[PDB]
């Protein structure tokens, strides 16, 4: 008798945990990729303007 009731209570929380975390994870990183990506991009456009002033002045 006792096995199945405790077995279900474990197995359910097992599937519950991953999936609320899986929810959060997909959102957050992916929003966190976006603005990441666009760092990296905009990083260079100023350098090049920046660096250019030095290069042309030389």
CB of 34 to other proteins, least distance (A): 14
Minimal distance, residue 33 CB to other proteins, in Å: 14
For the bound state, the minimum distance from the C-beta of residue 55 to other proteins, rounded and expressed in Å, comes to 7
Q: Which residues bind other proteins (CB under 8 A)?
A: 40-41, 44, 48, 52, 55-56
Longest Cα–Cα distance in the chain: 86
CA separation for the pair 32, 58 (Å, rounded): 40
Is the Cβ of residue 24 or residue 48 nearer to other proteins in the bound state?
A: 48
- Going from the C-alpha of 19 to that of each of 11, 12, 25, 40, 52, the distances in angstroms are 13, 11, 9, 31, 50
């Amino acid at each position: 008798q006792l096995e199945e009731v405790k077995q279900a209570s474990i197995k359910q929380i097992q599937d519950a945990i991953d999936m609320e975390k899986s929810q959060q994870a997909l959102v957050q990183k992916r929003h966190y990729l976006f603005d990441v990506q666009r760092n990296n991009i905009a990083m260079a456009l100023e350098v090049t303007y920046r660096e250019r002033l030095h290069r042309v002045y030389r």
